[model samples]
Target chain A: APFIMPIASKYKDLGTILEGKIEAGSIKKNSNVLVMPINQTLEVTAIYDEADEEISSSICGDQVRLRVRGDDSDVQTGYVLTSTKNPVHATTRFIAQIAILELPSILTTGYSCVMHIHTAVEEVSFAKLLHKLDKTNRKSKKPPMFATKGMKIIAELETQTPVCMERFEDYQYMGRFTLRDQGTTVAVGKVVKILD
Target chain B: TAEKAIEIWKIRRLVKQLINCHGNGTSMITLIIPPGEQISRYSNMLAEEYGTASNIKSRVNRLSVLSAITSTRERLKLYNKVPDNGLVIYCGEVIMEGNKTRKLNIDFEPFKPINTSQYLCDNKFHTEALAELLNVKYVQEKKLIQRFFDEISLDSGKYCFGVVDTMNALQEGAVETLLCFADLDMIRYITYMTKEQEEKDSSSMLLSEWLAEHYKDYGANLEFVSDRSQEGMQFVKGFGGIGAVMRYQLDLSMLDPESDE
Candidate 1:
């Protein structure tokens, strides 16, 4: 879920309140919830519906504001409020299946790329090339020379700074992202495996 | 002799890891503050005997752990005691100990000797943990300062000095090891863009905090040479009080705005 602060600005003084659509099951108010990346737990103090009215709970697709109880510094603007039952931790490095879209130059190992994952965008170092994939079939080509435009490939990505990441098989919504360099979207990728 | 040699080898292995990179490839610890200093964000890890895993601390730990090989001083132990100033400081790693998946425990090799030749203030004496790491000798009479000027000078590419050049070397991972001198006693600043503000911020930062934040993960060492003595001043002053010994010759022309860095 994306982080969006609502018109109810007074809650900022109360505690950390998260505003976003509930993509999955319902969240019970006054229940414990976990924040991702920081890996800390806090309780849902209150949940507000669209009518600016306090609600007991919220279901899927319902845009609600959850006021979290905890220290102010733990939760940042880009953090996701989730549950410990289904937790997502941030990773600094991972392997991604990427397809080059448009690049001025051929992409090689050591090339710098930027990634957009959910609300997080960070500059990542393209560490190495595992193999390239056939444009039509998605099967890998061994001993990948380099990744050119329109070539689907799997390569290792290491972020200069770590960001919250979701595995494509697990969290499809947060897992997919594109590689941008020099303000140009060079390729798009999905988190295939986390390299920690 | 064979048994004694094996013990020496074990101490050598740990000593290298303390301040230098081990083959295990753990992120290097660069910013080492001596045992007594206070750090806010993280625990200092400078225990009563061990040290945080920085180069200086590791060297101190090497000596301390070696001392561990010798038993405590008694009539029998007196003959085996390694000769030194009888001073023991702390050097080693501050690691999280989690056996039961519980809260992280602070584990640091504590109370190491301030006896490694590196910890000695002056080569002639083993006095302090701060200066012996100099790995150099100098005075106002002009030997070390001459090399200092040469490294930061325009002609040499292997050495970089001053704040911006040293930082560029660090960011590129080109710093072989933290050679040269760093003046932590003065103010330092970093250029960063605030996300909300979308503006660049040049905020003041302490040398220790800056080192921890910027270069802790890199395999670099911080050896701030005290040019004067117990009271020293003004050798690294002109070079922005920061410098680096580069692994390879680096052309720092990219620091220019026109050249995309």
Candidate 2:
């Protein structure tokens, strides 16, 4: 089974406490979970529901806080806690096919903006325009140097820091993303391939 | 010793860069020679290895090995005798994009003593010895960890363990010495929300990133320890990987006890 939950907030209670909504699978007390980006595995010491009542386990759509055993000083908002066997990929670069929803100016290579993927927010830029996806035949051809509004293109994106992600075909929650510039949503996209 | 630290940083920086390179097959060569002895001693060996590589059945392997050996020998010839510490050389045609190749020839003198003489040809360059030289501070790290645990055995509140507790003590300016694992992976960051509602995020960031930004405010002696030593491993495994020696005895348990929850 696969587990994925982005740590939305964290604090120190009886131990290192992490709060988040489970996006997939389920987490149980005493179970071991792997925190991505840092890749540290920790034992879940306790789980609490919204009312601060102790809980034994939580499933997707449930908001819960988990107190884990380990040094969680590096754990931050956007860091995902997942099952070790199928952990999210911590990547700095990836290929994505994005639909340009709106932009004041044409988007081209080296265009930098903030990307919101699940709970993780990262600064990303277009490294290359690989192709323009053909809607009818579902084929791809050489993309133009720039893209305008309402266009769909395949591009390589480079993030300022390593972000937990996956191919859209693999996991939808970690794969789907949104790009925003100046507090406005500019485009919507999904990861195609995570690069080294 | 302070002036020598700069030299170590330089060599460590170069070694890190070399560590990033990946060569095709066993084409990459790393030659580390100790101080003294003749440079010809190693050059002759590389020359002989180049000749021996001709027997390699694969042309690709043979050509890459010969090129790396020749390049190492050529770089070795530049030095009449090894430096007082030692000399290190890395040579190979590294793999590049689009099936292309690029040559990397890096040679440097060790900043500190290195006892081993190594000649390796592998898919990746070997900078382990150079990396090992920088392990000089593990002794001091061990001493600090010992002091932290000794204070713990005393059952006094002069020590604080766990990231949140230590960070809290730091904010109180009660920490005399802060001991953190050198490889501790944590960041402290802040995301500002609307000021009107006062609903905002005030934390999460890289530990190192946080130290660089806020260490000055606390004024505590910061020591980074590694888990290579037994005591240091205990500090990581027993303690929460982050701990501090406080200036005065203070009860942290009273601050955040499991009261109603």
Candidate 3:
């Protein structure tokens, strides 16, 4: 089983407390969690709910909170906590299979836009063009090198904000994303290879 | 019409995990470049170790980040939708020397245009002057952020301004939106000490980056008002180039009250 928690707030004296519905596993006091982005081992100090009631353990849909034994300055908002045995992490770069839903212009290697992944809104770029596929059948287009409206392609994306991603073949929930700019929506895609 | 609805439904179904994955981290990169081309051209500053006519084998700047910069500029201008001269505030990394781990390179584009003098290079100065005349154009209930300061003048509570107070507000998770001058002063990272000791210091990021990162980390929004278009200096002089709308009425007990405004 994998343990995961999304961060809500961090306090100076109280350490770091993250809030999220336990998706796959259980969380309890005295258990260990590996925090990513900083990659530190922290102990769970306590758990609570919106009403401030203390609880020993929590499961999915309860809206519970866990206070860990760590420094406030050490953890900021958006940082995650997971079981040491199986932890999800962030990467600045990755390979993605994308379909252009609409476009203001053609996106070639080096095109960048804000990506909407999970709750992460970040700037990501097309680092390299790997493959260009037909929009419908997912067949490779001749050269496999350019991006146009309503086309499918595989390209390397460089992220400005670190995203918590997993291999699509492994975890579908953490494997997809969207790209957008001021008033234009660029494309939607799924992770093919995660390159940290 | 119905098929469009089906597409929306499929899209919604694809991201049921959105609630569990919540965090606000924003990145942007604004570059000044020409049309059609991907990267801006700059003269090589490094010692000439190689030679060429069409191209020189010298260390180049902004080469790797060329595509990133152009795309960002392109998107900001709405590409084919609108036309704009290359002037924007970008929030992303460039391929500095187009390599990783070789040098600390970042975009520190200025928010205000520099005043040109006759004594300076005449042609170069005029070329830049022509550019700033291009794109210039913000909100409310956002009622005026100006009202945020207007009330603080008569009554001292709720909204806050200045760097220390605003940073403290950010630490407390109180700021809802940040307002500040778009000047390069904040974006320019100060070397901790002598230039020779730059790499050794721990905190190498700029004040703007530090504050912006924490602001987004805390689920707040950022607003960079232009020095060229807005009265940003009013806030910069009194507020240290930063201010914010707090989530709740601020007592500022942690910060020294009766502090100079």
DockQ score for model 1, please? 0.01
Give, for candidate 3 chain B, the lowest lDDT window spanning 10 residues: B117-126
After superposition, candidate 1 runs with Cα above 4 Å error: A1-11, B1-261
lDDT of 1 by residue, B1-261 (tens): 322322333333334433332211222122223333223212212232133323345565455332322221111122222222322322222333352211111122223324332221111211233233212333421343444444433345666665567777787756854433332453454552212243534366655346744554777654444435311222343333456667688777646767555
- Report the lDDT tens digits of candidate 3 across residue range B33-145: 33333231211201111122114232243332343334344344443311232332222332233354221112222223333211111101112332443332333312344
Runs of candidate 2 with Cα error greater than 4 angstroms are B1-261
* TM-score per model (chain B): 0.36, 0.52, 0.41
RMSD of 2: 23.5
Instruction: Please write out the lDDT profile of model 1 over residues A45-107, one tens digit for every residue.
Output: 889899999999887668787887766465665566666776555788898888889975445
Query: In candidate 1, how many Å is residue B133 off?
Result: 28
TM-score of 2: 0.43
* Docking level for model 1: incorrect
